[PDB]
């Protein structure tokens, strides 16, 4: 069921690129799912501060 290798439960990524136009904002992330892991995309969200 559970691994006993050292491994994070939660990852935070930062925009590899961003754009800041007059009417909208873009961010690009390299979402990297490593070997022997699987990501239920329902667990993801974008954390915005402003």
């Amino acid at each position: 069921v559970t691994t006993d290798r050292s491994q994070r439960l939660t990852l935070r990524f930062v925009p590899v690129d961003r754009e800041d136009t007059t009417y909208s904002y873009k961010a690009r992330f390299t979402l990297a799912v490593g070997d022997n892991r699987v990501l239920d995309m329902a667990s993801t969200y974008f954390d915005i501060r402003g």
């Binding site: 909208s24 690009r28 390299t30 974008f46």
Partner: protein, 49 residues
């Protein structure tokens, strides 16, 4: 300031509640071909969305 202006009356300004929409509706572009989001397998770059 004047003797007539003692007789002014004031009324509270109308309540106006401002915040984000339910579930953050509208904060992300969905259903717009002009600003379409991307979830693509690097390095084929075929967008899955």
């Amino acid at each position: 300031s004047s003797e007539t202006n003692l007789t002014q009356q004031s009324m509270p300004n109308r309540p106006n509640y401002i915040g984000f929409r339910d579930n953050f509706v509208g904060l992300m572009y969905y259903n717009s071909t002009g600003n379409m989001g991307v979830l693509a397998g690097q390095a084929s770059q075929l967008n899955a969305v």
